[PDB]
Amino acid sequence: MDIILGIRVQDSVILASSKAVTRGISVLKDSDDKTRQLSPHTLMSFAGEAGDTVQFAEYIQANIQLYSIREDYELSPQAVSSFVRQELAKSIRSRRPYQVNVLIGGYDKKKNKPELYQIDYLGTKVELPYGAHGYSGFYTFSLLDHHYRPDMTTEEGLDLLKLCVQELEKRMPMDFKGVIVKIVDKDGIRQVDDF
Amino acid sequence: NNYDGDTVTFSPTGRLFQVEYALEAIKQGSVTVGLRSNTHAVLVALKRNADELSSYQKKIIKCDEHMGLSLAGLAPDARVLSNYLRQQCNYSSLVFNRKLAVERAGHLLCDKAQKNTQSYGGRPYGVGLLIIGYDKSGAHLLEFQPSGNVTELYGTAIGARSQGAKTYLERTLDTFIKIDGNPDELIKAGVEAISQSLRDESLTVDNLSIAIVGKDTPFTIYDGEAVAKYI
Amino acid sequence: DRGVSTFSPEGRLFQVEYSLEAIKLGSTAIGIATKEGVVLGVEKRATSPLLESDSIEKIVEIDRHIGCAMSGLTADARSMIEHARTAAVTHNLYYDEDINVESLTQSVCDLALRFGELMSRPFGVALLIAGHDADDGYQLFHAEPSGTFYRYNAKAIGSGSEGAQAELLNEWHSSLTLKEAELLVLKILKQVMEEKLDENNAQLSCITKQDGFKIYDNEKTAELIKELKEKEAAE
Amino acid sequence: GYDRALSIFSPDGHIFQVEYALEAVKRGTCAVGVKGKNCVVLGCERRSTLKLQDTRITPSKVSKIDSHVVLSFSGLNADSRILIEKARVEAQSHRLTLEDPVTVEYLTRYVAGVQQRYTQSGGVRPFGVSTLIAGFDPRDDEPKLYQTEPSGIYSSWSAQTIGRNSKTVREFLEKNYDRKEPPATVEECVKLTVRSLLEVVQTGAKNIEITVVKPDSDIVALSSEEINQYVTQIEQEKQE
Amino acid sequence: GSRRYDSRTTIFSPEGRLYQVEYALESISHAGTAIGIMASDGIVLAAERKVTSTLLEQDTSTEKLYKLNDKIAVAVAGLTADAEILINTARIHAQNYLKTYNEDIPVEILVRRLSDIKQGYTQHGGLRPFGVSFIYAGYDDRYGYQLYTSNPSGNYTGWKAISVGANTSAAQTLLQMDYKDDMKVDDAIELALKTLSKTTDSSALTYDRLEFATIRKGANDGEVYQKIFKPQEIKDILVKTGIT
Amino acid sequence: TQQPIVTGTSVISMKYDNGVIIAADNLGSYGSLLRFNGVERLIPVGDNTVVGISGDISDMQHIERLLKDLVTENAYDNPLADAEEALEPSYIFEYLATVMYQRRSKMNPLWNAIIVAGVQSNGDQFLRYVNLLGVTYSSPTLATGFGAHMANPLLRKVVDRESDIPKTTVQVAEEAIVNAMRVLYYRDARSSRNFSLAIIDKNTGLTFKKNLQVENMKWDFAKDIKGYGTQKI
Amino acid sequence: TTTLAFRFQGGIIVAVDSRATAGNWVASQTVKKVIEINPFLLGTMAGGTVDCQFWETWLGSQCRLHELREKERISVAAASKILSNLVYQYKGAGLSMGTMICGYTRKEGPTIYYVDSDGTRLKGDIFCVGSGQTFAYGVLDSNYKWDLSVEDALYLGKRSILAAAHRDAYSGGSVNLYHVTEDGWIYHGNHDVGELFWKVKEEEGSFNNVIG
Amino acid sequence: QFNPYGDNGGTILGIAGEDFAVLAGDTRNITDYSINSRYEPKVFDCGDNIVMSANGFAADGDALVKRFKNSVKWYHFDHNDKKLSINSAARNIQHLLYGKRFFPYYVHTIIAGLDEDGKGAVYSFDPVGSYEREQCRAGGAAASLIMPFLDNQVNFKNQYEPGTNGKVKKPLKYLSVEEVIKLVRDSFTSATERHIQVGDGLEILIVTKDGVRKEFYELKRD
Ligand SMILES: *[C@@](C)(CO)[C@](*)(O)[C@H](Cc1ccccc1)NC(=O)[C@H](Cc1ccc(OC)cc1)NC(=O)[C@H](C)NC(=O)CN1CCOCC1
Ligand SMILES: [Mg+2]
Ligand SMILES: [Mg+2]
Structure with missing residues (x-):
């Protein structure tokens, strides 16, 4: 885990998530996908404590998929984010809390708008034009403050994202082995293979 | 009639019909005999089969190195009660380093059977047991009835046609009680006792079941070719 | 009404006796034990021709060394099988060995009387449990809802049981080969079955020390049916 | 807790509560399942004593358990919801632990197990419901059709019907369905299903529902006009 | 023991019917008639109070029509006390959904859960079922205006127009006669009152023996308003349609 | 989890x-x-x-x-x-x-x-x-607390192994116990002069002795001891 | 410990050492760190001996129950997830495990899953687990190609354990080799480091740091 | 704060032959610098030709042996008097030990007997249940002293054939019961010399197909 970013543009939400899985002084894997598709137009990236992350992501995934089958209907990104926040808000006062931070990128088909939600392990939800968890924010936020515009295209968003990854690769202490980038829009979720 | 729907109901003459019907299951069961001397205690049991293709239902169960019983009636109920005895014998060993007295074993079975005759929902045990054992006060023989009534005896028999063996032992009392330091003769007396309850059938090699416990003899069961000696 | 765990005046549990009537309505199942193995066979009895008969699963594996056939309310057997499988695997976990066929049967029979006012009624299904272990060799057990089990050299349960059992009484001897037993199950099944016996409405299985428990293919059973018809015509 | 043993044996060896639950199924609207060479079709009767219905919102007779499996039923409607919900939850639980969607046999086995549990549990009555469960196993193109019933028994069927007048439509299917050659196409399978319901239904208007399931989570429900075309075509060939 | 006195509320008849559910429905058939009619631009809920006394306080009274949330209402037919138990559950269930998803509960989801509770009382627990039939009238952004009904069996169905309680057979025939799909709310108001006026067991239908409610999008722009009619407002609408 | 408040010291036996x-x-x-x-x-x-x-x-x-x-x-x-x-x-x-x-x-x-x-x-x-x-053990001589450190050495001089038991009379055994009790009074700061002693014999049965006192104590040599080194007075 | 398993053209190689330690005390030199769950399934052990030993043989019981219930051998993914979901329930309690669930099935092909006691579960081609994992990685990575022959792949797995056995103080004893194919796993012997080191040194010309 | 564990010292040793197996242990029991007993046996015959010892904290050791002895008893009741094999006993003990994984039995457990082919068998356990069959194992306080000596004399480790240039190893062979007991006695006398918690007496339990025999030898009492 470590680096997860998110950028909402005019017509889509773009999530970038690091590929490295490190444990001790060894990088065990350099191709890890730190994300789960909750519904056809909703994607959740995650970072935090080992084990907790995937366990939480898949637990949410199962619940949203259960809802979809029961109602034959897709929950809005806002509705999914509120469900996720409540689960983390319960968790924080449990015997052993989920130590997982998430970004939820979704395309609301009723509003025809992209939506990006940042939720930390405490259950602190915020809707944002761009988001990051962990130390990534300490570089990317100031960079995006400068270069981000609300009316950008998906291609402009990817170039803006390349700028963030380049900055992180230059100044971050750890090698996070690049990122897997995914785009969420009106046509659903797809992965950029060459980044 | 109207007072046999459950065990919690008394009849107008003060009878518990469910307990009496449980007692009836014992009478249908195959005959088993118990007797003892001052040194050894012996169980003899007539086993019963479903047909010629089936095995013969085992009647005797070991409870500890120094104790065990024979059954007549519902076999699963004997398994429940024998398992309880195994635990109680075992509790006495682990906690107090003490072999459970055969008399206490009876008291425990009595109290377990009784609780099933005073509460709604439950049912009486449908089996009669003959417990033999050798403890610090010598050899013992007990007769358990699912009414709760436990009785210490020199000899006895329960099951179908048990009255024949019970009459024989009542005549033979003075003889077999003094068979001390002789296992084979005490068994012979028990095998002759159970023979008074036979009709049309005789004791064969896979039909007879004998058990013995005594002064220098752990509770052991004899079946198959090991009982051929006594036919 | 009346209590579920009530005794009759003859000293029998009403519900257990009534469950035995349900088993008599069930489809026929036959088991034969030899020194070369134990054979289990059942009547499938499809209620309609549109029903795909291969989905009728009345012979079942418990472990590699223990198999099981059923008769009566076959839905009731699912939890009995589940318990048997868990009991078998659990014993292997605790003791690093195969569990005795008798101990397995006893474990299944402990469920039987756990009913009253635990489950609400006895099981309405009888089981034929066949297996092998190193101590007592090839064994066949008949497990009832009374909590009682008998070891058998051969046994039939179900609607054609009393007619088949009388036939097994004459045919069984202590020197039967496995092949002889296979044919004997087919022969006796064909006698008591309503519809004409073939590979689709009857199923065979066996347990051997070497190859363990195996349900036969419809192709393999079909050849044994053809071999059986030829041998009866040959004298 | 309420403990009463409601499902119990009778002197003749019958569990009357389970058998009376079958009567509830016999009262329910007819449901039919027919599987072709590359598909399964679930047909369902809808009684026409109810006009002024709102068909947009009224619970559909065929329910998706997962994206690849469907469940139709006959009997008590309220009871069916409890089975469907449990089945849907188990479907997601299976994906979570096995990392693979349920097989149709597994899902059927689960639902049948639930039904059985309610026949020997204290304080409960059996489900007054029989189900037809149809679909395709993951990465498999062989059609699957299973039937369950209140007792808990389940089995696979080339074609089957349940509910009221099911014995009439089963009679039809038994002579019209060839095991050697099942309906080769979707059109053939739907037509045979509609034909079989027309033996019992009344009018082929808003009385028949048809749901087609194809491999790889390809499930679609036919509209009124689409079904009405089959009804119109069948009647014209009949007048001969 | 206590087996002797057990009615066995959750068992089947030999015909495969649930005795208690059938008898609960028989109970409901004596309750005051309630009618729901769904129009393209709103929904009408009309209900007849059970034989009123002149000294009954009419304005501060609630017997038939209850509010579940801002978008959903119910008309009751049966035991009022039973209905209130279920209504408070439904009110809580709506708030749980809003708390969880930050969105008003879809009508069907609320109806299903309430109907699932009723179903439970027919299958387990050994208790009597709720002697209540609901007409649910509500709006959400998925299906728009919706009418449902649930009954003691826990079975629910959707409707364009429906009646529960007394004389449903006669009422349903009349609704089936005059109902059409392009209908407006004001027309539906008139149909609801006309139907009660003909099916009523009373001599004449008056304001004091009625409860009335509408669910329109007649607020200001793309939002739904619930109107539980006051006594004087029922008096006026009864004159406006020429019943009194 | 406890801490002991009112406490009893050595129990000795053989x-x-x-x-x-x-x-x-x-x-x-x-x-x-x-x-x-x-x-x-x-x-x-x-x-x-x-x-x-x-x-x-x-x-x-x-x-x-x-x-x-x-x-x-x-x-x-x-x-x-x-x-x-x-x-x-x-x-x-x-x-x-x-x-x-x-x-x-x-x-x-x-x-x-x-x-x-x-x-x-x-x-x-x-x-x-x-x-x-819950630690258990058996030995010809057993003692707790300070007894384990001071009594056992003395009692083991009488019964050092199993074969020494038949050779030890009740007079010799009691004498050793009473001597050990005196030594404990000299050296254990939480001991008292008054004690109880019990003999369980296979012939004479249980003899319970109460209100015994430590006696024949050596204290006279204390008068000669002066200061802690160089002091002569 | 040092355990590895890697995927390649000809299936999966699995190699482990055989040392057990209690601090600096060498407890054993002959420990089995591979458990044969079934003919198509292997599990490697690193961390607390009992935690691995106990729960992986328990895993084998769960896999047996799956094929009894489902009439089909369990997938490597499902097998690994039973173990990972189990240890996740004990997360924080202090279980110590670094395991690798290796096996072949029809639907998956050759598959390796890393599962540890803090709940991490990862699919991957190459993993080294244990106190000497870094030493094994060094040799394995620098010599790994997908197109290795079965003969060369077996040696590389053996040589990588030897590398770690030599440098890591808490690794050694002997090397246990396994090869997993479409037909199942095949055992390729126990190789004592006592003889293997000198044999490799002489024949390969490596280990020049050591006094020959 | 109350400390539920203690250290009762002592040491144990199990060797396996071709048709026999020995399980030895000193009879000294200690706490801190005091001797509790010079003869307190901790090697027990558990029935079915299985000898067992759980060395370390005696309260836990006795508790475990007591539970396993009881486990054997119930194995007979539940499985028709079947003999509990040494491999089955070993697995059963793992579950006894792991049952208290988070509040362990503070003991190094060793059992000995014969396998189902009649060959000598020794199994050894850590405190929480990890087990392994071996030819040789020392356990307890002086395990670190004795074990390397056993590697050298039982398994012939570091011993090469004279004149073969350190190329041919000394071949493995089974030892006679006479030779094994010599090694046991020398192991314990050496351990007694250099470890303070070891001494007083040595009790060896030998297991053959004929049963369980005992031998006792004096050790230094200082
Ligand atoms: C190498 C040798 C580095 O330790 C391996 O990780 C090895 C893995 C292994 C797997 C299966 C079979 C044998 C060996 N690990 C060990 O040998 C292990 C090291 C270890 C000790 C304690 C730990 O707890 C944090 C974790 C790892 N050694 C043991 O488990 C030894 C045999 N047992 C004990 O130390 C007994 N302890 C264990 C923990 O609980 C208290 C008792
Ligand atoms: Mg090293
Ligand atoms: Mg000393």
Whole structure:
């Protein structure tokens, strides 16, 4: 885990998530996908404590998929984010809390708008034009403050994202082995293979 | 009639019909005999089969190195009660380093059977047991009835046609009680006792079941070719 | 009404006796034990021709060394099988060995009387449990809802049981080969079955020390049916 | 807790509560399942004593358990919801632990197990419901059709019907369905299903529902006009 | 023991019917008639109070029509006390959904859960079922205006127009006669009152023996308003349609 | 989790040819304060067992009640309660040992060291130790606390192994015990002069001696000792 | 410990050492760190001995129950997830495990899953687990190609354990080799480091740091 | 704060032959610098030709042996008097030990007996249940002293054939019961010399197809 970013543009939400899985002084894997598709137009990236992350992501995934089958209907990104926040808000006062931070990128088909939600392990939800968890924010936020515009295209968003990854690769202490980038829009979720 | 729907109901003459019907299951069961001397205690049991293709239902169960019983009636109920005895014998060993007295074993079975005759929902045990054992006060023989009534005896028999063996032992009392330091003769007396309850059938090699416990003899069961000696 | 765990005046549990009537309505199942193995066979009895008969699963594996056939309310057997499988695997976990066929049967029979006012009624299904272990060799057990089990050299349960059992009484001897037993199950099944016996409405299985428990293919059973018809015509 | 043993044996060896639950199924609207060479079709009767219905919102007779499996039923409607919900939850639980969607046999086995549990549990009555469960196993193109019933028994069927007048439509299917050659196409399978319901239904208007399931989570429900075309075509060939 | 006195509320008849559910429905058939009619631009809920006394306080009274949330209402037919138990559950269930998803509960989801509770009382627990039939009238952004009904069996169905309680057979025939799909709310108001006026067991239908409610999008722009009619407002609408 | 408040010090014991001897002083210490002087720390069970207890006194009194209750319970439905089915030392020990280990396993121990001395029904000497940890052991001589460090060395000079037991009389054995009690009074800061002694013999039975005193003490040499080194006066 | 398993053209190689330690005390030199769950399934052990030993044989019981219930051998993914979901329930309690669930099935092909006691579960081609994992990685990575022959792949797995066994103080004893194919796993012997080191040194010309 | 564990010292040793197996252990029991007993046996015959010892904290050791002895008893009741094989006993003990994984039995457990082919068998356990069959194992306080000596004399480790240039190893062979007992006695006398918690006496339990025999030898009492 470590680096997860998110950028909402005019017509889509773009999530970038690091590929490295490190444990001790060894990088065990350099191709890890730190994300789960909750519904056809909703994607959740995650970072935090080992084990907790995937366990939480898949637990949410199962619940949203259960809802979809029961109602034959897709929950809005806002509705999914509120469900996720409540689960983390319960968790924080449990015997052993989920130590997982998430970004939820979704395309609301009723509003025809992209939506990006940042939720930390405490259950602190915020809707944002761009988001990051962990130390990534300490570089990317100031960079995006400068270069981000609300009316950008998906291609402009990817170039803006390349700028963030380049900055992180230059100044971050750890090698996070690049990122897997995914785009969420009106046509659903797809992965950029060459980044 | 109207007072046999459950065990919690008394009849107008003060009878518990469910307990009496449980007692009836014992009478249908195959005959088993118990007797003892001052040194050894012996169980003899007539086993019963479903047909010629089936095995013969085992009647005797070991409870500890120094104790065990024979059954007549519902076999699963004997398994429940024998398992309880195994635990109680075992509790006495682990906690107090003490072999459970055969008399206490009876008291425990009595109290377990009784609780099933005073509460709604439950049912009486449908089996009669003959417990033999050798403890610090010598050899013992007990007769358990699912009414709760436990009785210490020199000899006895329960099951179908048990009255024949019970009459024989009542005549033979003075003889077999003094068979001390002789296992084979005490068994012979028990095998002759159970023979008074036979009709049309005789004791064969896979039909007879004998058990013995005594002064220098752990509770052991004899079946198959090991009982051929006594036919 | 009346209590579920009530005794009759003859000293029998009403519900257990009534469950035995349900088993008599069930489809026929036959088991034969030899020194070369134990054979289990059942009547499938499809209620309609549109029903795909291969989905009728009345012979079942418990472990590699223990198999099981059923008769009566076959839905009731699912939890009995589940318990048997868990009991078998659990014993292997605790003791690093195969569990005795008798101990397995006893474990299944402990469920039987756990009913009253635990489950609400006895099981309405009888089981034929066949297996092998190193101590007592090839064994066949008949497990009832009374909590009682008998070891058998051969046994039939179900609607054609009393007619088949009388036939097994004459045919069984202590020197039967496995092949002889296979044919004997087919022969006796064909006698008591309503519809004409073939590979689709009857199923065979066996347990051997070497190859363990195996349900036969419809192709393999079909050849044994053809071999059986030829041998009866040959004298 | 309420403990009463409601499902119990009778002197003749019958569990009357389970058998009376079958009567509830016999009262329910007819449901039919027919599987072709590359598909399964679930047909369902809808009684026409109810006009002024709102068909947009009224619970559909065929329910998706997962994206690849469907469940139709006959009997008590309220009871069916409890089975469907449990089945849907188990479907997601299976994906979570096995990392693979349920097989149709597994899902059927689960639902049948639930039904059985309610026949020997204290304080409960059996489900007054029989189900037809149809679909395709993951990465498999062989059609699957299973039937369950209140007792808990389940089995696979080339074609089957349940509910009221099911014995009439089963009679039809038994002579019209060839095991050697099942309906080769979707059109053939739907037509045979509609034909079989027309033996019992009344009018082929808003009385028949048809749901087609194809491999790889390809499930679609036919509209009124689409079904009405089959009804119109069948009647014209009949007048001969 | 206590087996002797057990009615066995959750068992089947030999015909495969649930005795208690059938008898609960028989109970409901004596309750005051309630009618729901769904129009393209709103929904009408009309209900007849059970034989009123002149000294009954009419304005501060609630017997038939209850509010579940801002978008959903119910008309009751049966035991009022039973209905209130279920209504408070439904009110809580709506708030749980809003708390969880930050969105008003879809009508069907609320109806299903309430109907699932009723179903439970027919299958387990050994208790009597709720002697209540609901007409649910509500709006959400998925299906728009919706009418449902649930009954003691826990079975629910959707409707364009429906009646529960007394004389449903006669009422349903009349609704089936005059109902059409392009209908407006004001027309539906008139149909609801006309139907009660003909099916009523009373001599004449008056304001004091009625409860009335509408669910329109007649607020200001793309939002739904619930109107539980006051006594004087029922008096006026009864004159406006020429019943009194 | 506990801490002991009112405490009892050493319990000492040994086997001799026909039975066992056990002894313990009558003091109930409250830290450094020698609070209670009438405390009996030897508790007879029947006429064939004595349980000697050191450590926490509140827990000792609890154990007293358990043993007292054990005698009552054994007598129930037991015609041979004063004969063949009387409580043996081995039964009493195993019961306590079970309790001690169960309590330590629940992290709530009875803060005691216990020595069960007695004679079995077949005449065999019984002497076994158990403590708060549930640790059990047997030896010809057993002692707790300071007794383990000072008494055992003296008692082992009399009975050093099994073969020395038949060669040891009750006179010799009691003399060693009484000597050990004196040494403990010299050197244990939480001991008292007053003590109790119990003899369980296979022939003469249980002899319980109360209000014994340590005597024949050597203190006279103290007058010659002056200062701590160089002081001459 | 040092354990590895890697995927390649000809299936899966699995190699482990055989040392057990209690601090600096060498407890054993002959420990089995591979458990044969079934003919198509292997599990490697690193961390607390019992935690691995106990729960992986328990895993084998769960896999047996799956094929009894489902009439089909369990997938490597499902098998690994039973173990990972189990240890996740004990997360924080202090279980110590670094395991690798290796096996072949029809639907998956050759598959390796890393599962540890803090709940991490990862699919991957190459993993090294244990105190000497870094030493094994060094040799394995620098010599790994997908197109290795079965003969060369077996040696590389053996040589990588030897590398770690030599440098890591808490690794050694002997090398246990396994090869997993479409037909199942095949055992390729126990190789004592006592003889293997000198044999490799002489024949390969490596280990020049060591006094020959 | 109350400490539920203690250290009762002592040491144990199990060796397996071709048709026999020995399980030895000193009879000294200690706490801190005091001797509790010079003869307190901790090697026990558990029935079915299985000898067992759980060395370390004696309270836990006795508790475990007591539970396993009881486990054997119930194995007979539940499985028609079937003999509990040494491999089955080993697995059963793992579950006993792991049952208290989070509040362990503070003991190094060793069992010995014969396998189902009649060959000598020794199994050894850590405190929480990990087990392994071996030819040789020392356990307890002086395990670190004795074990390397056993590697050298039982398994012939570091011993090469004279004149073969350190190329041919000394071949493995089974030892006679006479030779094994010599090694046991020398192991314990050496351990007694250099470890303070070891001494007083040595009790060896030998297991053959004929049963369980005992031998006792004096050790230094200082
Ligand atoms: C190498 C040798 C580095 O330790 C391996 O990780 C090895 C893995 C292994 C797997 C299966 C079979 C044998 C060996 N690990 C060990 O040998 C292990 C090291 C270890 C000790 C304690 C730990 O707890 C944090 C974790 C790892 N050694 C043991 O497990 C030894 C045999 N047992 C003990 O130390 C007993 N302890 C274990 C923990 O609980 C208290 C008792
Ligand atoms: Mg090394
Ligand atoms: Mg010394």
